[PDB]
Every structure is written in structure tokens, then in C-alpha cells.
């Protein structure tokens, strides 16, 4: 049996709103930069991040995005945090002026750094404004329960790509 490497990149989408949230869940969502429903963020997976995801498990749906999902997310909804402003990534110079010191100078470099979690993944990911995704076209199953019990919350392994396709 060949056991593949455990995935090192996750996409996290906040699926519940901002009403009646416990303080710990609220704090962890703020640290994940998910302050609004249907906001998405790339998360580098390790013990600390996974335990944070476990804390905010009922409020999020997360999974392992593929190359196509990363491309669609960066190209259609990719916005940079340039001078604390949400600027659309309409030119490569916008990426180069903020991340060129790390070697990232284009959309392709940004996508590569996000997909293959590189040395400067933290800088490249924080440069991206959190993705403001639409409502899931076709609806959800049940946002109040876990994915493995017929709902939408929690870790769906690679069905996050289906969710993304319906989501943006």
C-alpha cells in the first residue's frame, strides 16, 4: 500500500454567521481571517492549525483544494492587501511591488506558492485578502451538522473542490 503524503494545504470556508458565537470560536475565526459568512482562506496544515480548525469545526467547512480550485480562486476572486486596501489583482506589478522581495512576481508565482506550500507561504497568503465567495449555488445539505453525518460543517476531504465550484 502506498499511503500518500498528508495534505499540507487546506481551504477553509466560514459557513455560519456572526450571531451568538462563543468567544473562543470568535477569536479563532478572527485569527483565520473569517469574519464574514462565505469567506474563504488558505491554511497551511500542521498540528497548531489543525487544532484551531477542530476548535472552529461547527462554523467552517474545510478541505484540500486542488490545482484547479487554487487557480479559479486566485484568478476570479484574488484581491491583494496592498497598503491595507483591498486591491484587485488586475496587473502583475501589484504582486511584484509587494512580494517581489520573496521572488513572487506574478499570478503564476502566487499560485505556485499557495499550492505547493513554499518558504514564503505566510507572506503570500497574508498578501491575499480573504476570498469573498458567493452563496453556494444549488444550496447546502445542512449547515448545522457535520459533513460525515449528512451536513456541511467540518472536514470534507476533497469535496471542498465541489463546494468551491458551486461557491464561486
Amino acid at each position: 500500500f502506498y499511503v500518500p503524503a498528508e495534505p499540507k494545504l487546506a481551504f477553509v470556508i466560514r459557513i455560519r454567521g456572526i450571531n451568538g458565537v462563543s468567544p473562543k470560536v470568535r477569536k479563532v475565526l478572527q485569527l483565520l481571517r473569517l469574519r464574514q459568512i462565505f469567506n474563504g482562506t488558505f491554511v497551511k496544515l500542521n498540528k497548531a492549525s489543525i487544532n484551531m480548525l477542530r476548535i472552529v469545526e461547527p462554523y467552517i467547512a474545510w478541505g484540500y483544494p486542488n490545482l484547479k480550485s487554487v487557480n479559479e480562486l486566485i484568478y476570479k476572486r484574488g484581491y491583494g492587501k496592498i497598503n491595507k486596501k483591498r486591491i484587485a489583482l488586475t496587473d502583475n506589478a501589484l504582486i511584484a511591488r509587494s512580494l517581489g522581495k520573496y521572488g513572487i512576481i506574478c499570478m503564476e508565482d502566487l499560485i505556485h506558492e499557495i499550492y505547493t506550500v513554499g518558504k514564503r507561504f505566510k507572506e503570500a497568503n497574508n498578501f491575499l485578502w480573504p476570498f469573498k465567495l458567493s452563496s453556494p449555488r444549488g444550496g447546502m445539505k445542512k449547515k448545522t451538522t457535520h459533513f460525515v453525518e449528512g451536513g456541511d460543517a467540518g472536514n470534507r476531504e476533497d469535496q471542498i473542490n465541489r463546494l468551491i465550484r458551486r461557491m464561486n
Binding site: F1, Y2, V3, A5, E6, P7, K8, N46, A48
Partner: protein, 159 residues
């Protein structure tokens, strides 16, 4: 309606562990406490003098003053919505050194040794400790054995 006694609720907190009563072992007195080192306040009940209050049991502080039998400890205490650095005099029976600080100083010394050695030998080495990474890909051999098939057992009432 609760009393304000200094030792209310300390019935088990200040009691000795099972079969560990009697004479206080003397290494506790033989420990050396300098100013600035980190100590944990426990508060054994065999010695009634210099006892810390129950709110400092289990806390950790920094030694700022050393006397013949006690030390002065700056320990954080949370009161309502503020944390203030209280100064308490605690006899050395009720304190012990902090192995967290001990391990951190060991790690600093070992990192400085690695920096010196790696600058001597050229090759760059990692010093920042990382969180547990995702497991890498690997092969699991069956060794010519079929994995055992597991099925849930039928229910039966036992007792």
C-alpha cells in the same frame, strides 16, 4: 455568605500527599534561588510559616528578593478585568524551580552552540522549532499477509 478566612477551601490543597507526611526532605532547603529566576509556588502544609495564600498555589513567578528563609516573588494575579503583579514573601519550602525555564535556557545554550558550529562548518541549519508537519508519503508492506477482517460483534447483555 462565604467566610473570608485565609485558609477556607484549602482542605486538600494544603494537605500532604498520601504516605508523604512527616519530616521535610532537606534538598528543598538546599536549593539555591537567585534573583530573577522562575519558581513555582506550591504551598505544602507541614510548614505553617511563610505560607502563600491559596490564590498563588499553582502559580509561577520570578524571584526578586532573597532573605534567610524566604524569597520575594513577583507573581501575576488576575483581579476582575485586570492582571496585577503582586509581590509575595514565601518561605522556600513552598517553592521549587521551574523546569520550563530550565529547558528554555538549555535550548538557548544548545542553539548558540549550533550557531557557532554551523558558522564554523559553513552549512546552514534550522533552529526555529516547527509544529508537527503532515505525514510524508510512505509504503506499507503487507509481507505476504492478508490484513485481518474486522466485524462488529453481536450484542449481548453481560451484567
Amino acid at each position: 455568605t462565604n467566610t473570608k478566612g485565609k485558609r477556607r477551601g484549602t482542605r486538600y490543597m494544603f494537605s500532604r500527599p498520601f504516605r508523604k507526611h512527616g519530616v521535610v526532605p532537606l534538598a528543598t532547603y538546599m536549593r539555591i534561588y537567585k534573583k530573577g529566576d522562575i519558581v513555582d509556588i506550591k504551598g505544602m502544609g507541614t510548614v505553617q510559616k511563610g505560607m502563600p495564600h491559596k490564590c498563588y498555589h499553582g502559580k509561577t513567578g520570578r524571584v526578586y528578593n532573597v532573605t534567610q528563609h524566604a524569597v520575594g516573588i513577583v507573581v501575576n494575579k488576575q483581579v476582575k478585568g485586570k492582571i496585577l503583579a503582586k509581590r509575595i514573601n514565601v518561605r522556600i519550602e513552598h517553592i521549587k524551580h521551574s523546569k520550563s525555564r530550565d529547558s528554555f535556557l538549555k535550548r538557548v545554550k544548545e542553539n548558540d552552540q549550533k550557531k557557532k558550529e554551523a558558522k564554523e562548518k559553513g552549512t546552514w541549519v534550522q533552529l526555529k522549532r516547527q509544529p508537527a508537519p503532515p505525514r510524508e508519503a510512505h509504503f506499507v508492506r503487507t509481507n505476504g499477509k492478508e490484513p485481518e477482517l474486522l466485524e462488529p460483534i453481536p450484542y449481548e447483555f453481560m451484567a
